[PDB]
Every structure is written in C-alpha cells, then in structure tokens.
Amino acid sequence: DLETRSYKYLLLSMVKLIHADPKLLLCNPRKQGPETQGSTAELITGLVQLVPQSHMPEIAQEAMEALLVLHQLDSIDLWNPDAPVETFWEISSQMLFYICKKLTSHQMLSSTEILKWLREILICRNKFLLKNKQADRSSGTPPICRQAQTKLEVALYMFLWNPDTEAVLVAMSCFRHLCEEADIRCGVDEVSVHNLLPNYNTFMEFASVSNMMSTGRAALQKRVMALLRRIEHPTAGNTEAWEDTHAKWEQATKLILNYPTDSLQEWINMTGFLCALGGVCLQADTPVSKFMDRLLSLMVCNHEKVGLQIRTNVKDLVGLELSPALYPMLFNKLKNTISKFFDSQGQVLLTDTNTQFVEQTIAIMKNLLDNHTEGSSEHLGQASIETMMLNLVRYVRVLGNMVHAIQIKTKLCQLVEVMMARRDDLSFCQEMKFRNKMVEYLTDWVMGTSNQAADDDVKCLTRDLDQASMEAVVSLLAGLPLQPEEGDGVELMEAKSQLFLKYFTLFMNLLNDCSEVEMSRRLASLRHCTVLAMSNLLNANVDSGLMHSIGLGYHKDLQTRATFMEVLTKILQQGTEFDTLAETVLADRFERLVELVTMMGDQGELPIAMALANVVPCSQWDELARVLVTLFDSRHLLYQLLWNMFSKEVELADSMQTLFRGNSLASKIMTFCFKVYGATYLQKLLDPLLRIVITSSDWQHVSFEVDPTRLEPSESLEENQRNLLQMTEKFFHAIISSSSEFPPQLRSVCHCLYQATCHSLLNKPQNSIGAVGSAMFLRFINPAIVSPYEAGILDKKPPPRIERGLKLMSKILQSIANHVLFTKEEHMRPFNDFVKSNFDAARRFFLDIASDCPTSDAVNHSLSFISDGNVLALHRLLWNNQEKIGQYLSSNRDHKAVGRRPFDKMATLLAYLGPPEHKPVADTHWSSLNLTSSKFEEFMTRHQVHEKEEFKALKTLSIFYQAGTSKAGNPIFYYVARRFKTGQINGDLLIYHVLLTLKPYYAKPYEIVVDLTHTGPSNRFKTDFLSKWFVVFPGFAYDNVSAVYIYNCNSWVREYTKYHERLLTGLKGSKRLVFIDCPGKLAEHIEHEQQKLPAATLALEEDLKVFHNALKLAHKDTKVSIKVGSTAVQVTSAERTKVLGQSVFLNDIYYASEIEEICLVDENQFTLTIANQGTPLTFMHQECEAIVQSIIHIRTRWELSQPDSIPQHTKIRPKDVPGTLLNIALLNLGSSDPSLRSAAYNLLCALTCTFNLKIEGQLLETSGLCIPANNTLFIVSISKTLAANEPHLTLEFLEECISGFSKSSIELKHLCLEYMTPWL
Amino acid sequence: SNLVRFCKHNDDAKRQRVTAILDKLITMTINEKQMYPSIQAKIWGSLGQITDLLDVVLDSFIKTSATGGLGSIKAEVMADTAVALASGNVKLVSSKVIGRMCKIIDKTCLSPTPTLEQHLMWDDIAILARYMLMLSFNNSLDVAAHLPYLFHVVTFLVATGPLSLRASTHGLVINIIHSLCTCSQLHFSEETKQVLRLSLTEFSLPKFYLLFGISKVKSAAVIAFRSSYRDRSFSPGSYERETFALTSLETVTEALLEIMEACMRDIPTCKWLDQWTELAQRFAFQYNPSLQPRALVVFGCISKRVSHGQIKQIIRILSKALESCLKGPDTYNSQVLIEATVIALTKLQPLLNKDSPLHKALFWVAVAVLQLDEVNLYSAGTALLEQNLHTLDSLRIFNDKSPEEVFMAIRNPLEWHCKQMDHFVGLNFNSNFNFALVGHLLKGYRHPSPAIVARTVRILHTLLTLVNKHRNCDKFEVNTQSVAYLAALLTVSEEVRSRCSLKHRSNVLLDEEVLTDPKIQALLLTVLATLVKYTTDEFDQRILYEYLAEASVVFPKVFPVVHNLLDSKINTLLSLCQDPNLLNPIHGIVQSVVYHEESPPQYQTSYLQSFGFNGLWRFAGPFSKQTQIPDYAELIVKFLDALIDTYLPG
Ligand SMILES: CCCCCCCCCCCCCCCCCC(=O)O[C@@H](COC(=O)CCCCCCCCCCCCCCC)COP(=O)(O)OCCN
Ligand SMILES: [Zn+2]
C-alpha cells in the first residue's frame, strides 16, 4: 500500500531537482550507440510520458516546467557538446510528435492546459533556430521534422472547434509562431514564405481576431468559421484535419440518435467547422460526397427525443456557413432527391416526409441566395438551378388548401422574388422558356375575395398569399417578352395577342375589387403592385398589347389613369428601331455623366472614383474594375487613375508586390489590364516558336531533363543540357527583340508602378526596375510559357516530354530577372554560367518600357470611342448605391462647400436621368472574364449538347455548311444569315456547332463565304454575344483564314457595321475581305460547279426586267437599278459605297409578300411603303406605272397564293395612332385631380416632338408642375392650332373624341364640346 | 359686351349699377358647378378682352374673396376665375395683381407687428398669394418684365404660414423658372438653357423641400390644391408651425441669384439686378421687426457695392438691437435682428474700399459677439471671423506684422472702454494676446452642431500659420507666441500630436528651455485642464491626461494651480474607473502631487486673477439652457458707439 505511494513522493522530488539545475544529470553523456539509444534521449522520453498521464496531476504539472527549462538557450548546449545543432532537432521534434498525437487521439481533462505549455515550447525552439541560422546556415530538415511539422498542424485545427473558449483563443494565437518560423528558414518572401507555407497570408489574420474581447461561443464561432472559409490551397495539414475529425463526427452522430445538452453542443461545433473547411478536401464515392448525403438524411430527422433541435440547426448551418466551393455539389444532390418525388407519368406523391423535405429545401435556398459573400459569384455559375425550381412549385401546387399549406406557398412565393435579384449571377440554359412558365403557374394562386366566401377570419392569410404572389410576378415580368408553347400551330403573331389578353383581364379583374368603395393599407399596397405589374407587361411587348391597353385611358380610378400615361410617355421617347436614336438622344443625354465620373479632382484626387471604390460592396468588384478601366482609357486618362489607386495600396502596405498579387479591388485592376491587352501580345509572339519545338522533325524526340534521379542512361546528359540551353536562347532572344510590339496600355501600367516604388524608395541598392522586371515577367510572361494550352495558345496539350522543357525554361528565365545564381540547385548549376552574360541584356528590355514619359504629351491617340455599352452599366451601378456613396462624400470635403463638388453634382444629375432601364435577357450561358477556348470546349463537351434535339435542328437549317473546295483547293464554308433568329435559340449552341465543324480543318488555311442575302434586324448579333466570337475560337485558326467572300450585301448591314465599328476595327481595311460586287465575279474566283450557294437565293436568279437608271429620290439621290423579280423586287444601287474601306454596290431585296403598300403617286415617281419601315421609298422613273403595273401584278399573284389574306391587322404601334393619344391627353388635361393634370402635360410634350407637330407656344417636359384647375382655355387653343396645321388627323381624332364623350361625366362633357367644334 | 360705356359714366351713380351686375354673375359661377367649363369660355373669357373694363372687374374679385377668408369657397373660386380673365391681357392683369402685392407689404410699416401672421393685413396678402400661384403657369405672369418684383416677394413668404401656403410658394418658384425656359420674347442661347434646366431639377430635390419647410410631404402639388374646393372651405389644423432659420434664406437667395445672372448675360443692358437691389435696400434701413431681418440677409447676398455711409447704418442697427434686448422682456423678437446684422456684414466686407480702417475694425465686432453666449449668435460670429482673416491675407496686411500688432494697434484709441470689458469677462488682451484670442475659441467645442466644430478648428489652423510665418519657424515650432494654438489643436490634429510628442512615451511640447516664464506656463496648464473638465470621450481624455501627468514632474512649482479644476472629476475616476489605458495616467498624477507636497506653496489657486485670467475656465463652459443676455452687454453698447465715432466721423 504505502510502498507504491513512496515511489511517487521520490519521483516527484527527482523531477524538481532537474527543474533546479539540469546540468547535474546531463554530465558524462553516454552518446548514442550504434545499436542502443544514448543517455540524453532516454532522460527526455521519461519526462514526456508523464504530461498526459492525468493519474498523477501534481507530477504532470511539474514535468511541464522541467521540460521547459531544458529548452532555454543556456541548457541546449548540454544535450550533446559534440554536436549541439544536430541532436537537438532530432530529440525535440520527436517530443512534439509524441505529444501532438495524444491530443488528437481523444479528449483529456487537462487538454486546455497542455496547450498553454505547448505554445511556450514553440517560442523557445524558434529562438534557437534564429541564432543557429545566424552563426552558420549550412538547420537540417530530416523526415521527422516534416513528419512532426504536419502532426503539429493537425492538432491546431481540431482544437478550433473545441467547446472551451480558452482553448480556441490560445490555439489561434499559436499560429504566429508557425508563421514566424517560416521567415527564419527562408528570408526571401516569394520563394519560400508562399511556397513552404502556402496559406501564409490567411494565418496572419488568425492573430488579429484572437486579440479581441471575449464573447459567448456563438459569437466567436462566427469569426472562426469565416477564417476557415478562406483556406484556398490544399495542404497535408488541412487534408488530414478534415478527415480525422470526420470520423469522430460520424460515430458521435450514432450515439445521439441510437440512444432511445453538452453532448449536442459539441456535435454542433464539429459540423460547423467541418463545413467551412470542406473546400480543401474537394476532389463518385469520396469522403466529401458521403458527408453531404448523411447531412441531407438529417434534414428530415424524425426523432422524438431531440429531433427538433437537429433540424433547426442543420438548416441554420448549411445555409449561412457552407463554403462557396461546395455549391456545385449541393445543388446536384439536392436536385436528384427532389426528382424522385415525381413518378413516371409525372404524378406527385404526398408522403408527409417529402412535405417536410421541401419545406426545408425552401429555407436552405433562401438563406444561401440571400447572402452576398466573397467569391460566391464565381461558383454560382457552374450549376443550373432551373430544373429544381420548376419541380419544386409542382409539388406545392397540388399540396392542397389549409392553414398549413398556405404558409408553405407564402414562403415559396418569397423565394422566387429573391431568385430574380441574382439572375445575372445564376446561369440559365433557357431563360424565356423558364420565366414564362413560372408566371403561368403563379397567377393561378392569386384569388381575390376568397376569404369572405370561406367565412373564416383564420384564413386572412390568403390576403398575404395574394399580396406575396404579385410581388413575385412583378419581378418576373420586368423585361420578359411573351412566348406561347407550340402545342398547336396558330401563327405566332395571333398566339401572343391571345396570350396577352389572358393576363391583362386577370389584372383588371383584380384591380376592380381593390377599389376602396367596393384593410386600407392592404388594398393600397395590393392595388399599387397590381398596377406596376401591368406596366412591366406592356413595356416588354408593345406591338402585341398596345391595342388591348388603350381602354385604361378612361378608367374609373383617377390614380390608375395617371400611371398609365407615365409609362406611355416613355415608349414614345424610345426608338421603335435602332434609328441611331440612342446614338443621338442617349449619347447627348448621357454625355455629361462621364464628365462627372471623370471629374479631375484637384491634384489628382478623383473623388468620384476613389469614393466609389470603397463604398461599392466587394461582390461587384469584378464589374467595377472593368467599367473604370474601359471608361478612363476612352478619355486618354488611364495613367491618372492608376497613380491614385496604386499609391494608396502601396503606401498603405510597404509590401507593394505581395498585395497586388493578392485579392483586392486594386489587384483585380491589374488582372483586367494584362488579360484584356496582353492576350494578343503573348499569342502573337510565342506562337511561331511553339510550332518549331512541338512539330518540327529537326527537334525530333529529345528529353529536356537534367535530373540525375530521373536522368535516362540512353540520352547523354551533355546533349540534353546543350539542347535545353539552346532552346532557352531561342525564347529569350524573341522576348527581348519584341520590345516595340508591347501594347501601350501595359507600358503606362509599368510606369505608374515604377514611380510608386521609386517614390516608395525615397521615403524608406534596391533597383526599382529589378522589382518591376521580376514582377511583370513572373505574372504576365511566365504563366503562358508553362501551360500554353490552358492559355489557349495551342489547341492540343503538349506532350509531357515537351512540357518539362517549358517548365525548366521558366525557372532559368526567372532567375535572370532576380540576378540570383543557383543555390542548393546543383541540378541546374552548370547553367549558371549562361545567365551571367544576359544580366545586362535583361535590364535594357525593362528600361525601355519603364522609360515611357510620365505624361504622354508626345504619345497620343485621340480615338475617343463612344463606348455605348459600358456607359449603361456605369449609370446602373450609381443608382443602386446612390445613398451610401453620399455618406462617404459627406464625411469629408468640409473645407469647401460641396455645391460645386461631387455630392451636389451627383444628386442633381442622377435624379435628372431617372431610374435605369431593366437589363435584357441573356441568350448565352453564364460567362465571365475567365473564359478561353479551352474552357469553352470543356464546358460544352461536358454538357450533353449532342442529344439536345435543338442542336440537331441546326443541321437541318443548313447554317455554316462545308461546300467542296476552292481554286487554291482550300475547303469552303457557307454561313446563311437568314437562318438565325435573334433569340429563339440559345446563342452558345450555334457557336459550338460552328466550332465543331471547323475543328477538323481549321488548322490548315481555309476560305469562308458568308451569304447576307435578305439580311434583316430580326437576324442579328447583339454587342455582348458578338464579342465571344473573337475569344471562343483557339486563336491560331484566325490566321488560317485564307479569304473571305461577301455576297448580296445590303444597306442595313452597312448600318450595323457603323454602330459596331469599334469591335470590327481589326477587320477595317482587311486584305482577306473580298466583296462580290456582281454575281459574275464570284464564280470566277471560286471553283464553278463546286460553289453551293443557297438554292432559294439562286431561285431569284436576278433574271427579270431591268429598269436601268432609276433614281432614288431622298435626302440624297443615288442611282438605283430595279429588277422586278417573279416573287420579289431587288433594288441594286449603281454607285459604289465604302464599307470597311472597300467599295461595293448595295443590293437591297424586298420580298413580294412583304409589300403591304403600293401607291403610284405619279407617273414621274411612285411610293413604296413596306412593313415597319417608317417613311416610304420614293424613286423617279419616266414610266412608273410600267414598273408599278408589274409590282401590282406580282403582289396580286401572291394574294392568290396565300391561303387567307383577309384575316390581318388587329395590330398597331404608337406611330400608327397619333390621333388616339392626342384625345386622351386633352381630355385628361382638364380633370379634377391635380396629379393627373401634371401627367397629361408631360404626355403632350412627348407627343408634339416625336411627330413634329406645329403649335404656337413651346412645351417643356418636367415633373412637379402645379397646373391651375381652370384649364378650359389652354386646351382650346392647342386644339384649334393643331387642326389648322394638321388637318389629316381629323378622322383619327374625331372618332375617338366621340367615344370618350359617353364615358366622361357631366362636367367633363361640356369640355369635349368646346374643343371638338374647331375640327369640323 | 356693352358695359364699356357705363363703367365711366361720369360717376352719375350708374357706375354703382354695373358692379351689381358683375357681383350677380360671380354668384352664378359659385353655384352652377356643372356648367363651369362653359361659363369660363363664354362669360369671363370674352369679358376679359375689354381693356377699359379690366380695372373695375379685377377690383370686385378681391372684395368678394376678402369676406370669405383665406380658405373660404368664395375666395378659392375667384382665383380660378382670374385665370380666364388674364388670358386676354397678360400684360395688364399680371402688372396689376403684382402692383397690389407690393403695396400691401409696403404698408406693414405703419403698425409693426412681431410676425406677419399677427399683422392685421395678413389675410389680404394670403388671398393675393393664391392669385399669383394660378397665374404663374404658362407665363400668365409676364416674367420678361416682372422677374425682379417676383423674387422680391418670394423671399418674404418662404416657409411662412399654414402648410398649404408653404407648399404654394414652392410651386410658385417652380413655375417661374419653367416660364423662363419657354418664353419667346427672350432669346436665350443654347448654353444658358442648360443652366435653367438643371436648376429646375434642383428645386425638386429633398434638399430644398427642407429649406422651404415642407419636409415630410411627398409631393407639393397635392397639398397645394384641394379637390373638393367648391363644396367645402379649407379646414386648417395642427397649428404647430416649424421655425425658420436665416441661414436657410441664404441658400435660397443665392440659388435664385445664380439663375438671374445667367439670363442677364444674354439680355443686353438688363436692369433686373438694379431693380431688385433697390427694393431690398428700402426695407433694410427701416424699422419693421417682421421684414427687416429678412431684408438684410438679402441685401448683402446680392449687392455689388458698399460705401462707408451704408456700413455706419448697419453697425448702428446692431447697437440698438442689443439695447432693446436688456430693456424689455421680449428677447427672441430682437435676438434675430442681431444674427442678421452679422450675416450681412459677413457678405459685404470683401467689397470694401480695400484701404478703409474698418477692414481691421471688424475684428473686434466679431469678438464682441462671441461674448454673448448664444448658439445662434456664436455660429454667426465665427463666420465673420473666419472670413475676416481670409480677406486680410489677399490684401497682404500680414506680410511684415503679427496679428497681435495689427489688431492691437487699431484698439489703442478707444482702450478706455475696452479695458472695463476685459475686467468682467475674465480675460485680458494686453497681458497675453495669443491666449485671450483662444479662450473665445474654446467654447466652440461645446456647440451642438458638428458643422461649427470643424469651422473653429480651421480658424485655429490659419491663426497658427500666421504667427509662425512672422518668425519663419516652419509653422510647427514651439515658442511663446505659438504655444496656445498647439494645446487647442492637440486633441484634434494628428500632425500636431505627432510633430509634438510627449517626451516620456521631433520636438516635444512642454520644453522647459523655452517655456521658462511662470506666467506663460501657468496658462498652458489651465488650457489642458479646461479641455478635460467638460470633454466626455475616451480618446480625448486619454491623450489629455498623458500630457498632464508629464506636466506634474516638469513643472512641479506651478502645477498646484490646477487642482480645483481636476479635483471633482479625478476623485470620481479613481473610485469607479476600470480602464487600464486611462487609469495609468491618473495614478501618475496622484503620486507626483504627494512627492512635490513638502514645502509652502509658491503659487496659490488665485494666482491667475493677479494678471486678469481669472475667468478663463468659466468662459469655456457649456452653453446655458436659460438663454439670456449675460447682462454685461451694457458696455458693448458704449464700445460700439465709440468705434463709429473714431473711424466714421461723418
Ligand atoms: C473574329 C470575327 C468577328 C466577326 C464575326 C461576325 C459574325 C459572323 C462570322 C462568320 C460565321 C462563321 C464563323 C467565323 C469564324 C472565323 C471568323 C474569322 O475569320 O475571324 C477573323 C477574320 O474575321 C473575318 O474575316 C470576319 C468577316 C465577317 C464579315 C464582315 C463583317 C460584316 C458582315 C457580318 C456582320 C455579322 C453578321 C450579320 C449581323 C450584323 C478575325 O481576325 P482577327 O485578327 O481579328 O482575330 C482575332 C485576334 N484577336
Ligand atoms: Zn446548358
């Protein structure tokens, strides 16, 4: 009994003796025997095994102090005087390896106490490393040092989720000592600090948060899980801490569930931790995939004991905490689980579990989409959320009616509203076909006056359900053209009008019930929404729904009438066609906007840009970067922006280079600059060299390897070394020579950095060029060389043996910039000789670019392009953040009144322009700056475009088909402009089809002929979709364009080119562009009997009578030759026109069926108005009736050909009814509601300018005018003057005036008499 | 259509008949609501085209409206009827409704009243205002000839009256600008028309809705007009009426002036600006407690020339306002005639002769106002001081002399009056100028408005850059002259804190090599104590206590004159403070006191009263809630009178 107790007392005393003096027991070392361990090692192992005992807490406490005295600098030498810097690391490292594995193994009572001692040991061993490195670097890193460095990290992560607050706070602090050791081992930051410890930058943040006030575990976990979400680079420590704690989590779950609060709180912490850091372990059956399924099988956890709390928390975490790198996997699993609810034949099955699982799937999606977090945007694009949403409504659709199921419907309606605020972030395969269906399904649930029939006030919630539904429908309809499902063939035009009438009546019926005479806030809000819904419906599609809406002019609600005219006013100001109407009206209207943004703040302050930077949320930093760079370049002030933006970042953080490579608003500016302009420069330069190494037989097969371990005996080392050096010279010489070809933009970019560092040096033999040269080369030139295939330079991935040479080439080249010889790199030391000569040469290349004038007074390019597309986004951005940007301006600028300073100017102008218009829909898939030919090909290949059955349709349409060969023998392709509709099909599938056909042959030179016969605005490419063609293709194929032939061009095409000139400037004066002025030329250059132009085009054949020397009377007269074809009329101009610097003759073609109007005003000249062409076409011929006779003959023949011409019309546009609108304006300009009159005056202003009406006074459109009530003589002088000057409107005006007489009241009836008489 | 002859029938009592006929027609319009659109076109539309008959017809409208009242149905309808009448002769009805407005206002002098709403003729103005509102649209008020007279009346109505009449004045302005853009008599170039359209937008921003006093109103038009104006009379309520601030009228009066100048560039030999000036100048120098304050803030904002004779009147209208305040119990009435005098002077100084003595004598008027302890006067007082220094620089008066030399030189002739003022206020300017001009500027930190706190900081910066430049000492050197301005900027300016750092963490404040005078180092400690007695902020107390702990050791002998100021607050901090950062400096103070306390005190607490500065700590206190004249202003009245006599003999 006491004998055992005696030993403990003796053992405790001995340990304290070592604490007092460690040299007493360290004298006369035994030294490590070849077959036995030494004496100092055996002593340490004895003390270590007492720390985690917990059977003898007093001894364990002392053992910590004893081992902490043997680590002081004084006592380190005594371990082994023979070699003090080799035995230490071996002994000390194994101590960490033993102890760390114990903490991870399981929880211990003193777990929070061993950690405080373990921190000190790290501090001590850092000190001994510092001095040893100082004295002699020679410091060794045996496998144990690596095998124990890992396990140290694996034991600092799994402590982050420990429940005790003190443990986690200490653990975060211990990351400093893990980083500070990195600097000692390698002074140079980039080489090792970001290579030995890849996630070095994030670790530094742990320290800052730890130095913060203590708070409950819930508050702390939020910051901890945030930091764990930014671990970008996988590492052995990360990839093993996730799995080690995954096993504990899985088994812990079984105990909680199987058993029929502290236990739960531990479970919650492990889950939150285990998700935020999931992204590292990413990359079929896998540990990560098994985590999700087990997670989803808990959202429906029905457990009487603790079921409620589990579901309440899994919803909270998966929503607000998941790592943005796991969204693409969450959706896929989520969609499949839903898909198995609809059995074959599409009948929903209600099991009361799926009901619970959909009610959760709605809450998870809402939180996930609602939160804007860093990096989320890049990942949302990959997945397609369409198919899941549609299936989701169907299940809720059949759920039935009850107090419970109504609440589910409510939230589902709220989700769709949040899902339409991120529509730009998400990706849609078919937006139109999807957004229409949701409108179809949702309108069903809107039922008014159903709570009175139900006779239960408990179901007042139905008022909320109707209130919620409209809010969703309003967001959906913003910019949505209607499209009917092609269940039957009833003609497209007639189907849409029928569809429009279906919705308009629905809203109108709902509108009458909301009348107050027939809760006031409820009706006030609901009525307000139901009117905004109609406004969005009309704007998108006026042609098919303007007639159905005219009845709103005389509505019974004066408020409703007021709104209708406001929306009606906007339509007139917009242009029915392109009309160069934004080129004039929008260009001038938004001209001032850039001047405000480009406000040259004194001494380069630029308050608008600088202020806009900080205030804008980080999510849109992508959009903000592109807009600023593009805009300032147009103004020739790019240098100014860079100096201001970089200076704050560089001066703020002396580590200038490091931050720029890091993620931030300033950083992203560089990325855009290099990528947008660099791409062309790199590919043009590197490409010729790549052919030589990859394909030339002279190079044949050789290994660019000098690794003795991998060195193959077959090849001589000398041969490889000399060849690799010779190849490097080829690349190096090319880079230095091509100094001129450097784009101006980067030249300016380098200068600003040069001035920044040079100014940075002044305040602080470092060479500014040295840092610049290494920086530019490392981030711009180096990446392309290593992997040209990914950059898109090379179609096919280089063979691995060729790949190795490029990799080694980069290292040699990079060393030249730093003027660093090969240290501990004997592998490449023989090459060190070569770099010596080229050190001076590299300097010259850097200086030339860095020698550009700080102010480019001499270097000038006054391009001053309009940049129409960019401006719209800029105005859109300002409107959203109008308030918040003001607050930033408000804080400063007190020295001078802001009346002449940004905030005053911003508010005035921004209000003046009014709200921005809604964005149009997107035909193409979601795409971002990070796009290249390799990326596009992989994405489409992974998609199953082959069997879509819409890809197949392109084959039938015969668009871009290969046709035989040419005189030179090159294959020919024919692209048909007619066959492509603007939006009816996704625009990416067209590119994939074209790319697929050209892939086999585009390597060799090829000739392409494009047929633009009968081109119209219907078949067109938008600005955004057009840009992809320049980038999607690999790029080397562009050079293989042997020749281009254009046939049957028309004026409309020329007009398009003028508007999109900037993008097509590259093709300006293009040698490859050859224009077929007449049919008799193409057959000569092309192989006759091989050309396969469209049969329909040839069917016209231009084989009818020619009325030579007909003159097109217009603003300018151009001789036009008219051919009256059998089925159409072709107008061929006889005067050459300049298109892209090449002369050509335009040949407009008018199909006979399209000839609605044929008026022969006189034998000298005839009138030919055509559908939606505005002013008719007038020409002069000596015998007009001879021509018109045939045209009437042609049209009359078609009338017989067509099945039913009598059914037509029932379609109108604002230009068609000048009279009708004039009536409602005048009638409502005397109403009794003050607001209504103000709207009427504005409508009159926007109606007297579009149609160039002549009135006596001048009218200006504004808001807020206070008009007098007695407007009984003003509208009796406007009416009189118009009738005198514009009599032709009599028939239109008089008919409508009568129709409003009946609807108006007694008091207004007398007014109609007053201004009606002058017209008779 | 035949009453032309009868209206001037030799006053044979037949003229009395036509007015009965006209009065009968007016009653038909009020009752026959359904036939309204047809009566206006026939009866009034045609009857208003007889020039000779306009004068009598228009007169009858005013009488009918008068009886009903401001919101009565009868008066409301005649306003609409006037629109049709004016279509025939815009040039005659417009120039006759305006002529009555300008004459009613000019008769308010006979029986002055504290406010317009309390004047007897208030109703006559109110109804006449609605006529101008309706006639504003579509240029039925001839702007091309009456623009001067319309702005003149706009300024006297902004933000006065019931919420209906306040929304009307906003509508009136929005229509006058609109008529300018769409008038054919004037030929505005395409450059000018851009200016007008931007101004048209500004007045509809929520910034100006506050200035006119109709904030919390979504739209002005809706309130201005009432739909059921024929059936029932207006029903005003919520008699609570916001206040009006003479600084707001500056923004309005300067926004309008911008529009007028733009037009004057095109119209050759225009007379608008000279007609507007005369109207303002007539009310400026005439006693009317209801219009004089508003007519002075407008005279200064627009005038282009000022003479000695005019300046004497402005400074002697300030003399009488002070006298009235103390004599009678009506204070707020006459506390706005002073705040308006200072704002006027703030605008007219840079137009002076450039060599008059008054360019320098307006530095003691600014000082004499800060001594009255009122938030509104104090805010207006600094605005004069800030610009007075700015003006003198452009005239290069500080080239070879120091502020003390300049301002103290023009104070010698009337020193006898000044000396007594310094005795009571508890500050002296002869003993130490650079510290007396800083007690007055230490109260600014206690102002509620965060926009005046910035102004005082800027004022200190400019004074600092002027004393050093006289010595050519880098603008931040520490000397006897430039030490008061560094203690004041210590807690707000980073450059002063960094460039002058505490030794016991360039040069360090509290240097004993240069600060070797007991008097110049006794003041420097009360300034630091003063800033902490009233300040309440962790960052401010931290920095100021660290500089006091070091003061205990560097200046052991003079430190005990700062006990009573620190006595009360320190005692509480020791008991309850729980801040390691803020508790360290306090302990260092306690230890130093006991160590130094071993000999008779060289200087008692009353050492400052010996040479004048006994009231420095009181003058930096918070603004009194019980707003009252300090009652020693009886000397400021005598001081000002001597100033006029000495430099403006006549
Ligand atoms: C890059 C092409 C841009 C224009 C594309 C227009 C859209 C139709 C193109 C034809 C459809 C079939 C696929 C064609 C793929 C190959 C295009 C090609 O050869 O591109 C090169 C040559 O381009 C051409 O020859 C295109 C000539 C097209 C016809 C002339 C333009 C006006 C008429 C067509 C307008 C668009 C269609 C009708 C709607 C307005 C570009 O040379 P680069 O040096 O600029 O390369 C980029 C390096 N950074
Ligand atoms: Zn797709």
Author numbering:
A (entry chain F): 483 to 620, 674 to 795, 831 to 853, 887 to 1121, 1134 to 1379, 1398 to 1953
B (entry chain N): 1954 to 2458, 2601 to 2745
Text from the published report:
The autosomal dominant monogenetic disease neurofibromatosis type 1 (NF1) affects approximately one in 3,000 individuals and is caused by mutations in the NF1 tumour suppressor gene, leading to dysfunction in the protein neurofibromin (Nf1). As a GTPase-activating protein (GAP), its primary function is suppression of the Ras signalling cascade by accelerating the GTP hydrolysis rate of Ras, which returns Ras to its inactive GDP bound form. The ubiquitous Nf1 isoform-2 splice variant Nf1-23a (2839aa) is, together with Nf1 isoform 1, which lacks the 23a insertion (2818aa), one of the two biologically relevant alternative Nf1 isoforms. Our high-resolution single particle cryo-electron microscopy (EM) structures reveal the domain organization and structural details of the full-length Nf1-23a isoform 2 dimer.
In the closed conformation, HEAT/ARM core domains shield the GTPase-activating protein-related domain (GRD) so that Ras binding is sterically inhibited. In the closed state, additional contacts between the last helix α63 of the GRD and the core bury another ~240 Å2 of surface. The linker between GRD and the Sec14-PH domain is in the closed conformation part of a Zn binding site, contributing a stabilising contact to the N-HEAT/ARM core. The closed conformation of native Nf1 is stabilized by a cysteine- and histidine-coordinated transition metal binding site between the N-HEAT/ARM domain and the GRD-Sec14-PH linker L2 and is formed by the triade C1032, H1558 and H1576, with the fourth coordination partner a solvent accessible water molecule. The tetrahedral site coordination is clear in map density and typical for Zn2+. In the closed protomer conformation, access to the hydrophobic core of the Sec14-PH domain that, in the X-ray models, harbours a phosphatidylethanolamine representing a membrane lipid component, is largely blocked by the GRD. In closed conformation, the GRD arginine finger R1276, critical for Ras binding, is not accessible. The 63-nucleotide exon 23a inserts 21 amino acids into the Nf1 GRD between residues Q1370 and V1371, extending helix α56 by one turn before it loops back into helix α57, with residues A1380 to R1396 remaining disordered at the lysine-rich loop apex. The well-defined linker L2 connecting the GRD with the Sec14-PH domain is unique to the cryo-EM model. No major conformational rearrangements in the Nf1-23a Sec14-PH domain core relative to the X-ray models were observed.
